[PDB]
Coordinates of C-alpha atoms in Angstrom, one line a residue:
Chain Q
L1 CA 112.9 115.9 104.1
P2 CA 111.2 113.8 101.4
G3 CA 111.7 116.5 98.8
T4 CA 115.5 116.0 98.6
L5 CA 115.1 112.2 98.7
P6 CA 114.8 109.8 95.7
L7 CA 111.5 108.7 94.1
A8 CA 111.5 105.0 94.2
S9 CA 112.7 104.9 97.7
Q10 CA 110.6 107.5 99.4
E11 CA 107.5 105.4 98.5
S12 CA 108.8 102.8 100.9
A13 CA 108.9 105.5 103.6
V14 CA 105.3 106.4 103.1
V15 CA 104.1 102.9 103.2
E16 CA 105.8 102.5 106.6
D17 CA 104.2 105.7 108.1
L18 CA 100.9 105.0 106.1
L19 CA 100.7 101.6 108.0
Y20 CA 100.8 103.5 111.3
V21 CA 98.1 105.9 110.0
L22 CA 95.8 102.8 109.6
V23 CA 96.4 102.1 113.4
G24 CA 95.6 105.7 114.2
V25 CA 98.9 106.5 115.9
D26 CA 100.3 109.9 114.7
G27 CA 102.7 109.1 111.9
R28 CA 106.0 110.8 110.7
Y29 CA 104.7 112.3 107.4
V30 CA 101.0 111.4 107.3
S31 CA 99.8 113.4 110.3
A32 CA 96.3 113.9 111.8
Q33 CA 94.6 117.3 112.5
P34 CA 92.3 118.1 115.4
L35 CA 88.7 117.2 114.9
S36 CA 85.1 113.5 109.9
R37 CA 88.8 113.4 110.8
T38 CA 90.9 115.4 108.2
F39 CA 94.6 114.5 107.6
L40 CA 97.5 116.3 106.0
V41 CA 100.3 114.5 104.1
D42 CA 103.0 117.1 103.1
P43 CA 103.4 120.2 100.9
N44 CA 106.3 118.8 98.9
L45 CA 105.7 115.3 97.8
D46 CA 105.3 113.6 94.4
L47 CA 102.0 114.3 92.8
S48 CA 101.6 110.6 91.8
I49 CA 101.8 109.6 95.4
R50 CA 99.6 112.0 97.3
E51 CA 96.8 111.4 94.9
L52 CA 97.2 107.8 95.7
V53 CA 97.8 108.2 99.4
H54 CA 94.6 110.2 99.7
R55 CA 92.7 107.2 98.4
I56 CA 93.7 104.9 101.4
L57 CA 93.2 107.5 104.3
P58 CA 89.3 107.0 104.0
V59 CA 90.0 103.8 106.0
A60 CA 91.8 105.8 108.7
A61 CA 89.0 108.4 109.1
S62 CA 86.4 105.6 109.1
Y63 CA 88.5 104.1 111.9
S64 CA 89.0 107.3 113.9
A65 CA 85.2 107.4 114.1
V66 CA 84.4 103.8 115.0
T67 CA 86.9 103.5 117.9
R68 CA 85.3 106.7 119.2
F69 CA 82.0 104.9 119.2
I70 CA 83.3 101.9 121.1
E71 CA 85.1 104.0 123.8
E72 CA 81.9 106.0 124.3
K73 CA 78.7 103.9 123.8
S74 CA 79.8 101.4 126.4
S75 CA 78.6 103.5 129.3
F76 CA 75.7 102.6 131.6
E77 CA 73.5 105.5 130.5
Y78 CA 72.5 103.8 127.3
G79 CA 70.8 100.4 128.0
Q80 CA 71.5 96.8 127.3
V81 CA 71.5 97.2 123.5
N82 CA 73.9 100.1 122.9
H83 CA 76.3 97.9 124.9
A84 CA 76.1 94.7 122.8
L85 CA 76.2 96.7 119.6
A86 CA 79.4 98.2 121.0
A87 CA 80.9 94.9 121.9
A88 CA 80.1 93.0 118.7
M89 CA 81.5 96.1 117.0
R90 CA 84.7 95.6 118.9
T91 CA 85.4 92.1 117.9
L92 CA 85.8 93.5 114.3
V93 CA 88.3 96.2 115.3
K94 CA 90.5 93.4 116.6
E95 CA 90.3 91.6 113.4
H96 CA 91.6 94.9 111.8
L97 CA 94.4 95.1 114.3
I98 CA 95.7 91.9 112.9
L99 CA 95.3 92.7 109.3
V100 CA 97.7 95.6 110.1
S101 CA 100.0 93.2 112.0
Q102 CA 100.4 90.9 109.0
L103 CA 101.5 93.9 107.0
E104 CA 103.9 95.2 109.5
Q105 CA 105.7 91.8 109.3
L106 CA 105.4 91.3 105.5
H107 CA 106.8 94.9 105.0
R108 CA 110.1 94.1 106.9
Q109 CA 111.1 91.7 104.0
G110 CA 110.5 94.6 101.5
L111 CA 107.6 92.8 99.8
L112 CA 105.2 95.6 100.4
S113 CA 105.2 98.4 97.8
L114 CA 102.6 101.2 98.0
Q115 CA 100.8 99.9 94.9
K116 CA 100.6 96.5 96.8
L117 CA 99.0 98.2 99.9
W118 CA 96.1 99.6 97.8
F119 CA 95.0 96.1 97.0
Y120 CA 95.3 94.3 100.4
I121 CA 93.1 96.9 102.3
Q122 CA 90.2 96.7 99.8
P123 CA 88.1 94.4 102.2
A124 CA 89.1 96.5 105.3
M125 CA 88.0 99.7 103.5
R126 CA 84.6 98.3 102.8
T127 CA 84.0 96.8 106.3
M128 CA 85.1 99.9 108.2
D129 CA 82.7 101.8 105.9
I130 CA 79.7 100.0 107.2
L131 CA 80.6 100.4 110.9
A132 CA 81.2 104.0 110.3
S133 CA 77.7 104.4 108.9
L134 CA 75.8 102.7 111.7
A135 CA 77.8 104.6 114.3
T136 CA 76.5 107.8 112.6
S137 CA 72.9 106.7 112.1
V138 CA 72.6 105.6 115.7
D139 CA 73.8 109.0 117.0
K140 CA 71.8 111.1 114.5
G141 CA 68.5 110.2 116.0
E142 CA 69.1 109.1 119.6
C143 CA 68.3 105.4 119.7
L144 CA 68.4 103.1 122.7
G145 CA 66.4 99.9 123.4
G146 CA 64.0 99.2 120.5
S147 CA 64.7 101.9 118.0
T148 CA 68.3 101.0 118.0
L149 CA 67.1 97.5 116.9
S150 CA 64.7 98.8 114.2
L151 CA 67.6 100.5 112.5
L152 CA 69.6 97.3 112.4
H153 CA 66.7 95.5 110.7
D154 CA 66.3 98.1 107.9
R155 CA 70.1 98.7 107.4
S156 CA 70.2 94.9 106.9
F157 CA 67.4 94.8 104.3
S158 CA 68.8 97.7 102.3
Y159 CA 71.7 95.3 101.5
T160 CA 69.5 92.5 100.2
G161 CA 71.9 91.8 97.3
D162 CA 75.4 92.7 98.4
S163 CA 76.1 89.6 100.4
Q164 CA 79.4 91.1 101.6
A165 CA 77.7 93.9 103.6
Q166 CA 74.6 91.7 104.5
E167 CA 76.6 88.9 106.2
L168 CA 78.0 91.7 108.3
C169 CA 74.8 93.7 109.3
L170 CA 73.3 90.2 110.1
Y171 CA 76.1 89.6 112.5
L172 CA 75.5 92.9 114.3
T173 CA 71.7 92.5 114.6
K174 CA 72.1 88.8 115.7
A175 CA 74.4 90.1 118.5
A176 CA 72.7 93.4 119.4
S177 CA 69.5 91.7 120.1
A178 CA 70.2 88.9 122.6
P179 CA 70.0 91.3 125.6
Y180 CA 66.6 92.5 124.4
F181 CA 65.5 88.9 123.8
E182 CA 66.6 87.7 127.3
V183 CA 64.0 90.0 128.9
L184 CA 61.4 89.0 126.4
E185 CA 62.0 85.4 127.6
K186 CA 61.0 86.6 131.1
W187 CA 57.9 88.4 129.9
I188 CA 56.6 85.4 128.0
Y189 CA 57.1 82.3 130.2
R190 CA 56.7 84.5 133.3
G191 CA 55.3 87.9 134.4
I192 CA 58.5 89.6 135.8
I193 CA 59.8 92.6 133.8
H194 CA 63.4 93.5 134.9
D195 CA 64.3 96.2 132.3
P196 CA 66.4 98.4 134.6
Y197 CA 66.9 101.1 132.0
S198 CA 63.6 102.1 130.4
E199 CA 63.9 100.4 127.1
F200 CA 61.6 97.4 126.8
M201 CA 58.4 97.7 124.9
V202 CA 56.2 97.1 127.9
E203 CA 56.5 99.2 131.1
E204 CA 54.6 98.6 134.4
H205 CA 53.0 101.2 136.6
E206 CA 51.6 101.6 140.1
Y207 CA 41.7 98.9 137.1
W208 CA 44.1 96.9 135.0
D209 CA 44.1 98.7 131.6
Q210 CA 46.7 101.2 133.1
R211 CA 49.1 98.8 134.8
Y212 CA 51.0 97.6 131.7
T213 CA 51.0 99.9 128.7
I214 CA 52.6 99.3 125.3
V215 CA 55.3 101.9 124.6
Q216 CA 55.2 103.0 120.9
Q217 CA 58.8 104.1 120.4
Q218 CA 60.5 100.9 121.6
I219 CA 58.9 98.5 119.2
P220 CA 61.6 96.6 117.1
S221 CA 59.6 97.1 113.8
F222 CA 60.0 93.3 113.2
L223 CA 57.7 92.5 116.1
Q224 CA 55.2 95.0 115.0
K225 CA 52.9 92.4 113.7
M226 CA 52.7 90.8 117.3
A227 CA 53.0 93.9 119.3
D228 CA 49.7 93.0 120.9
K229 CA 50.0 89.3 121.6
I230 CA 53.2 90.1 123.6
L231 CA 51.4 92.4 126.0
Chain J
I1 CA 113.7 110.5 79.2
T2 CA 114.5 106.9 79.8
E3 CA 112.1 104.0 78.9
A4 CA 112.0 102.8 82.4
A5 CA 110.6 106.3 83.6
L6 CA 107.7 105.8 81.2
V7 CA 107.0 102.3 82.7
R8 CA 106.9 104.0 86.1
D9 CA 104.2 106.5 85.2
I10 CA 102.1 104.2 83.0
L11 CA 101.6 101.8 86.1
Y12 CA 99.8 104.8 87.6
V13 CA 97.9 106.0 84.6
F14 CA 96.2 102.5 84.6
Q15 CA 94.3 103.9 87.7
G16 CA 93.6 107.6 87.1
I17 CA 96.5 109.1 88.9
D18 CA 98.8 110.9 86.5
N19 CA 105.1 112.9 82.4
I20 CA 101.8 111.5 81.4
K21 CA 98.9 113.9 82.4
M22 CA 95.2 114.1 81.7
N23 CA 90.1 113.5 77.0
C24 CA 93.3 111.3 75.8
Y25 CA 96.1 111.2 78.2
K26 CA 98.3 113.6 76.3
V27 CA 102.0 112.9 77.0
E28 CA 104.5 115.7 77.1
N29 CA 111.7 115.1 74.8
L30 CA 111.3 111.5 73.8
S31 CA 111.3 109.6 70.5
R32 CA 108.1 109.2 68.4
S33 CA 108.1 105.4 68.8
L34 CA 107.6 105.9 72.5
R35 CA 104.8 108.5 72.6
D36 CA 102.6 106.5 70.3
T37 CA 102.7 103.3 72.4
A38 CA 102.1 105.3 75.6
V39 CA 99.1 107.1 74.2
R40 CA 97.2 103.8 73.5
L41 CA 98.4 102.3 77.0
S42 CA 97.5 105.6 78.8
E43 CA 94.0 105.7 77.3
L44 CA 93.2 102.2 79.0
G45 CA 93.6 104.0 82.4
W46 CA 91.1 106.7 81.1
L47 CA 88.5 103.9 80.7
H48 CA 89.0 102.9 84.3
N49 CA 87.8 106.4 85.2
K50 CA 84.5 106.1 83.4
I51 CA 83.8 102.8 85.2
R52 CA 85.0 104.2 88.5
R53 CA 82.9 107.5 88.4
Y54 CA 79.6 105.5 88.0
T55 CA 80.4 103.1 91.0
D56 CA 81.2 106.3 93.0
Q57 CA 78.5 108.7 91.9
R58 CA 75.8 106.2 92.4
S59 CA 77.2 104.8 95.6
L60 CA 76.4 108.2 97.1
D61 CA 72.7 108.8 96.6
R62 CA 70.4 106.5 98.6
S63 CA 67.6 106.6 95.9
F64 CA 69.0 104.1 93.4
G65 CA 67.1 101.1 94.6
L66 CA 67.9 97.4 95.4
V67 CA 68.9 96.3 92.0
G68 CA 71.1 99.3 91.3
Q69 CA 73.2 98.2 94.4
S70 CA 73.8 94.6 93.3
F71 CA 75.0 96.1 90.0
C72 CA 77.1 98.9 91.6
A73 CA 78.3 96.2 94.0
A74 CA 79.1 93.7 91.1
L75 CA 81.2 96.2 89.3
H76 CA 83.7 95.9 92.3
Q77 CA 84.3 92.2 92.3
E78 CA 85.3 92.9 88.6
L79 CA 87.6 95.6 89.8
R80 CA 89.5 94.0 92.7
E81 CA 90.9 91.6 90.1
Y82 CA 91.9 94.6 88.0
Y83 CA 93.7 95.7 91.2
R84 CA 95.4 92.3 91.5
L85 CA 96.9 92.7 88.0
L86 CA 98.3 96.1 88.9
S87 CA 99.9 94.5 91.9
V88 CA 101.8 91.9 89.9
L89 CA 102.9 94.4 87.3
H90 CA 104.3 96.6 89.9
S91 CA 106.6 93.9 91.5
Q92 CA 108.5 93.4 88.3
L93 CA 109.1 97.0 87.6
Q94 CA 112.1 96.7 90.1
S95 CA 112.2 93.5 83.8
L96 CA 109.3 94.5 81.7
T97 CA 109.1 97.1 78.8
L98 CA 106.4 98.9 76.7
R99 CA 106.3 96.1 74.0
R100 CA 106.0 93.7 76.9
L101 CA 103.1 95.4 78.4
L102 CA 101.0 95.2 75.3
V103 CA 100.7 91.4 75.6
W104 CA 100.2 91.6 79.3
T105 CA 97.4 94.0 79.1
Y106 CA 95.8 92.9 75.9
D107 CA 93.0 91.0 77.6
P108 CA 92.1 93.7 80.3
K109 CA 91.7 96.0 77.3
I110 CA 88.5 94.2 76.6
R111 CA 86.9 93.6 79.9
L112 CA 87.5 97.3 80.5
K113 CA 85.9 97.8 77.1
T114 CA 82.6 96.0 77.9
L115 CA 82.2 97.3 81.5
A116 CA 83.0 100.9 80.4
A117 CA 80.3 100.5 77.7
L118 CA 77.9 98.6 79.9
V119 CA 77.5 101.5 82.3
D120 CA 76.5 103.9 79.5
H121 CA 73.8 101.8 78.0
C122 CA 72.1 101.7 81.4
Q123 CA 72.4 105.2 82.8
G124 CA 68.9 106.3 84.0
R125 CA 67.5 102.8 84.6
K126 CA 66.6 101.9 88.2
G127 CA 64.9 98.8 89.6
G128 CA 64.1 96.0 87.3
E129 CA 64.5 98.2 84.2
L130 CA 68.1 98.0 84.8
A131 CA 68.1 94.2 85.1
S132 CA 66.4 94.4 81.7
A133 CA 69.1 96.6 80.1
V134 CA 72.1 94.5 81.3
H135 CA 70.3 91.5 79.7
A136 CA 70.2 93.2 76.2
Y137 CA 74.0 92.7 76.2
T138 CA 73.9 88.9 76.2
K139 CA 72.7 88.8 72.6
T140 CA 76.2 89.2 71.3
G141 CA 77.6 85.7 70.5
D142 CA 81.2 86.7 71.4
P143 CA 82.1 83.8 73.7
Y144 CA 84.2 86.0 75.9
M145 CA 81.7 88.7 76.4
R146 CA 78.5 86.6 76.6
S147 CA 80.2 84.6 79.4
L148 CA 81.1 87.9 81.3
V149 CA 77.8 89.8 81.0
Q150 CA 75.9 86.6 81.6
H151 CA 77.5 86.6 85.1
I152 CA 76.7 90.3 86.1
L153 CA 73.1 89.3 85.1
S154 CA 73.2 86.4 87.6
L155 CA 73.9 89.0 90.4
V156 CA 71.7 92.0 89.2
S157 CA 68.8 89.6 88.8
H158 CA 69.1 88.2 92.4
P159 CA 67.1 91.0 94.1
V160 CA 64.4 90.8 91.3
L161 CA 64.0 87.1 92.1
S162 CA 63.8 88.1 95.7
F163 CA 60.7 90.0 95.3
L164 CA 59.2 87.4 93.1
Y165 CA 59.8 84.6 95.5
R166 CA 58.2 86.9 98.2
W167 CA 55.2 88.1 96.1
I168 CA 54.3 84.5 95.2
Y169 CA 54.6 82.4 98.4
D170 CA 53.6 85.0 100.8
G171 CA 52.0 87.8 98.9
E172 CA 53.7 90.5 101.0
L173 CA 55.4 93.0 98.6
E174 CA 57.6 95.6 100.2
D175 CA 59.7 98.1 98.3
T176 CA 59.9 101.7 99.4
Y177 CA 61.4 102.4 96.0
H178 CA 59.2 101.3 93.1
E179 CA 61.1 98.5 91.5
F180 CA 58.8 95.4 91.3
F181 CA 56.4 95.5 88.4
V182 CA 53.4 94.9 90.8
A183 CA 52.4 98.4 92.1
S184 CA 50.0 98.4 95.1
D185 CA 47.3 101.2 95.8
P186 CA 46.9 102.4 99.4
Chain V
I1 CA 116.7 105.6 120.8
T2 CA 116.2 102.1 119.2
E3 CA 112.6 100.6 118.9
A4 CA 113.9 97.5 121.0
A5 CA 114.8 99.8 124.0
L6 CA 111.2 101.1 124.1
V7 CA 110.0 97.4 124.2
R8 CA 112.3 96.9 127.2
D9 CA 110.9 99.7 129.3
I10 CA 107.2 99.2 128.4
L11 CA 107.4 95.6 129.8
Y12 CA 108.0 97.3 133.1
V13 CA 105.5 100.3 132.9
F14 CA 102.9 97.5 132.7
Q15 CA 103.6 97.0 136.4
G16 CA 104.3 100.4 137.9
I17 CA 108.0 100.4 137.7
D18 CA 109.3 103.1 135.3
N19 CA 112.9 106.5 129.4
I20 CA 109.3 106.1 130.4
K21 CA 108.6 107.7 133.8
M22 CA 105.6 108.7 135.8
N23 CA 99.2 111.3 135.8
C24 CA 100.0 109.9 132.4
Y25 CA 103.3 108.1 131.8
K26 CA 105.1 111.1 130.0
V27 CA 107.9 109.7 127.9
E28 CA 111.0 111.8 127.3
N29 CA 115.1 111.9 120.9
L30 CA 112.7 109.6 119.1
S31 CA 110.2 110.0 116.3
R32 CA 106.6 111.1 116.8
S33 CA 105.3 107.7 115.5
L34 CA 106.9 106.0 118.6
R35 CA 106.0 108.4 121.4
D36 CA 102.2 108.3 120.6
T37 CA 101.9 104.5 120.7
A38 CA 104.0 104.3 123.9
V39 CA 101.6 106.7 125.7
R40 CA 98.8 104.6 124.3
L41 CA 100.4 101.4 125.6
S42 CA 101.5 102.7 129.0
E43 CA 98.0 103.5 129.9
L44 CA 97.8 99.9 131.0
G45 CA 100.1 100.6 133.9
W46 CA 98.2 103.5 135.3
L47 CA 95.2 101.1 135.4
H48 CA 97.5 98.6 137.2
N49 CA 98.8 101.1 139.9
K50 CA 95.1 102.2 140.8
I51 CA 93.8 98.5 141.4
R52 CA 97.0 97.6 143.3
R53 CA 96.7 100.5 145.7
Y54 CA 93.1 99.6 146.7
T55 CA 94.0 95.9 147.5
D56 CA 97.2 97.0 149.3
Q57 CA 95.9 100.1 151.4
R58 CA 92.9 97.9 152.5
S59 CA 95.0 94.9 153.1
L60 CA 96.6 96.9 155.9
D61 CA 93.8 97.9 158.3
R62 CA 92.0 95.2 160.1
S63 CA 88.6 96.9 160.2
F64 CA 87.5 96.2 156.7
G65 CA 85.3 93.3 157.6
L66 CA 84.8 89.7 156.2
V67 CA 83.1 90.6 152.9
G68 CA 85.8 93.4 152.3
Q69 CA 88.6 90.8 152.7
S70 CA 87.0 88.5 150.1
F71 CA 86.7 91.4 147.6
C72 CA 90.4 92.3 148.1
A73 CA 91.3 88.5 147.7
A74 CA 88.9 88.3 144.6
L75 CA 91.3 91.1 143.1
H76 CA 94.5 88.9 143.4
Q77 CA 93.3 85.8 141.4
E78 CA 92.4 88.3 138.7
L79 CA 96.0 89.7 139.0
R80 CA 98.2 86.6 139.0
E81 CA 96.8 85.9 135.5
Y82 CA 98.0 89.4 134.6
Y83 CA 101.3 88.3 136.1
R84 CA 101.3 85.3 133.7
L85 CA 100.9 87.4 130.6
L86 CA 103.7 89.7 131.6
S87 CA 105.8 86.5 131.8
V88 CA 105.1 84.9 128.4
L89 CA 105.4 88.3 126.7
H90 CA 108.9 88.9 128.1
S91 CA 110.2 85.5 126.9
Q92 CA 109.4 86.5 123.2
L93 CA 111.4 89.6 123.7
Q94 CA 114.6 87.6 124.5
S95 CA 110.7 89.0 118.2
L96 CA 107.8 91.5 119.1
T97 CA 107.4 95.2 118.3
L98 CA 105.0 98.0 119.3
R99 CA 102.7 97.2 116.3
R100 CA 102.6 93.7 117.7
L101 CA 101.9 94.5 121.4
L102 CA 98.7 96.3 120.6
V103 CA 97.0 93.1 119.5
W104 CA 98.6 91.2 122.4
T105 CA 97.3 93.6 125.0
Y106 CA 94.0 94.6 123.5
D107 CA 92.0 92.3 125.8
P108 CA 93.7 93.0 129.1
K109 CA 93.1 96.8 128.5
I110 CA 89.4 95.9 129.2
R111 CA 89.7 93.6 132.2
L112 CA 92.0 96.3 133.7
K113 CA 89.3 98.8 132.8
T114 CA 86.4 97.1 134.6
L115 CA 88.5 96.2 137.7
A116 CA 90.0 99.7 137.8
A117 CA 86.5 101.1 137.7
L118 CA 85.0 98.5 140.0
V119 CA 87.2 99.6 142.9
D120 CA 86.2 103.2 142.7
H121 CA 82.4 102.7 142.6
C122 CA 82.7 100.8 146.0
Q123 CA 85.2 102.9 148.1
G124 CA 83.7 103.3 151.5
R125 CA 81.4 100.2 151.4
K126 CA 82.1 97.6 154.0
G127 CA 80.2 94.4 154.9
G128 CA 77.1 93.6 152.8
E129 CA 76.8 97.1 151.5
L130 CA 80.0 96.2 149.3
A131 CA 78.4 93.0 148.1
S132 CA 75.5 95.2 146.9
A133 CA 77.6 97.6 145.0
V134 CA 79.6 95.1 143.1
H135 CA 76.2 93.6 142.0
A136 CA 75.1 97.0 140.5
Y137 CA 77.7 96.2 137.8
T138 CA 76.0 93.2 136.4
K139 CA 73.2 95.2 134.8
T140 CA 75.5 95.9 131.8
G141 CA 74.7 93.5 129.1
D142 CA 78.2 93.4 127.7
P143 CA 78.7 89.6 127.5
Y144 CA 82.4 90.0 128.4
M145 CA 81.9 92.2 131.5
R146 CA 78.7 90.6 132.8
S147 CA 80.5 87.2 132.8
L148 CA 83.5 88.7 134.7
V149 CA 81.7 90.7 137.4
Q150 CA 79.2 87.9 137.8
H151 CA 82.2 85.9 139.0
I152 CA 83.6 88.4 141.6
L153 CA 80.0 88.5 142.9
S154 CA 80.2 84.7 143.3
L155 CA 83.4 85.1 145.3
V156 CA 81.7 88.1 147.4
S157 CA 78.3 86.3 148.0
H158 CA 80.0 83.3 149.7
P159 CA 80.7 85.4 152.9
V160 CA 77.1 86.9 152.9
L161 CA 75.6 83.4 152.3
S162 CA 77.9 82.0 155.1
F163 CA 76.2 84.2 158.0
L164 CA 72.7 83.6 156.5
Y165 CA 73.1 79.9 156.6
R166 CA 74.2 80.3 160.3
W167 CA 71.5 82.8 161.4
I168 CA 68.8 80.5 160.0
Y169 CA 69.7 77.0 161.1
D170 CA 71.4 77.8 164.3
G171 CA 70.4 81.3 165.2
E172 CA 73.9 82.2 166.4
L173 CA 75.0 85.4 164.7
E174 CA 78.6 86.4 165.4
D175 CA 80.2 89.4 163.7
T176 CA 82.5 91.7 165.7
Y177 CA 82.3 94.0 162.7
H178 CA 78.7 95.0 161.8
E179 CA 78.1 93.4 158.5
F180 CA 75.0 91.2 158.7
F181 CA 71.8 93.1 158.3
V182 CA 70.4 91.5 161.6
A183 CA 71.7 93.8 164.4
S184 CA 71.5 92.4 168.0
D185 CA 71.1 94.4 171.2
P186 CA 73.1 93.4 174.4

């Protein structure tokens, strides 16, 4: 009953429940609604709080939509790139489970006012806003293999002057392209093409202009210049 | 209405969140000596809106270019600090008064005076034409402003010097949005 | 119900031993912000019961073969370590909370999600046909899983390599259970 509760103290109750909301666990007051996740706070709360709470929650919704990309895109029906892109996108969620641990401990001592929260999460509101834009531009147009590596070379060039969201999208591409580059090492120094899922740029067949054919979709758009010398 | 209650709401009006409501933040009793000092203090928060709307309206459309990002992403490093000051001021409210705020927030009444007037002089400029309209703010002489804007220029003019060092040593210009002053013909 | 009491029972649900009772571990008061994380954390036990049943049920019958015994054994060296974590974690309790367990047990929710899904893909496979169905989990790419399963295969290929190095240099195949792909006729 936060309506019949004092002003300066109920803020310390929201910042406790608010921390739980960042984790994604249903809180006491700041609850979640069934599914882009939309929340509800309370009908009877101070106007100068809800208008401030609703400014933080866009880091919860951008997390209830990245954890749902990790627990999904790790299946075997997607290839060896939509896997590594979902692992290197899981190391970050761990580093966000710590930045909410340091706050759960610094709040015990009373040193965490709501106005103090809106400052500490500023970097965790910008990182979780890049991973929640690749996880929606990889599912918009179904990408697996090469086309999910062309996207991570253009979403990394569009941020050519940010330097805080380019050191990130250069960590995803540098990690979501090792499995693609470990079969290329086998199709360069040798002739064997493993590629269990149909994702590599070159596919074999069963007098020789029809055996190996360049596939047009799965070209990483940064090997486009040498799409011929590879084959 | 106690003076402490005003100190509670003002620390929110510095952000946009509204006794003090929303172009002057008209406050609505109390003595005249209090309303006047609130009015000027509340108005500083209004400025913060004009600089926030730009870095939110233009962070939406994807047709602002590559320079218009390093500008819209350099108005944020000059806002996290304004969010650190609001952090410190709130920890002491648990003592500071109105006349004590005026000295605390006398300097960020200027940085929020140049930035809130730097985003209006360059409204429709995209590409290099924006890096040329945040350079027309350096001919000012004021040693406090000429050393602030001459830093935002050092970030906004980084993408421009990225095409230049590309179109000189490799001759491969690439800009889906027309920013570079070298226009190719298919 | 105190938060410390929940930290006492969860330390047991991680093993199978049940406030938290037994397919989800439905907990039965307390605030909603507590029940949700408990149900989320307890889903490590339900992954522990399934792997334990496969190693136990098949450690009973003597008609599982030589390769099958190695696979069951290969699932215990990857469980003593899960027995060491439960140990260190309990010592701290004698401070840790739910908001602190999630980071502690975020990694062993994955190893207990490959192993608990590696024993279902190979259910009725005995002999070499099992060493060929724990190799169809290496084509995954995930650098954390492909470096775990590619170790259980190393502890599942030893028996298959044993026969082969016997049926090549000495020509004396011996397997009461039919595992080797070279079947003799009396």
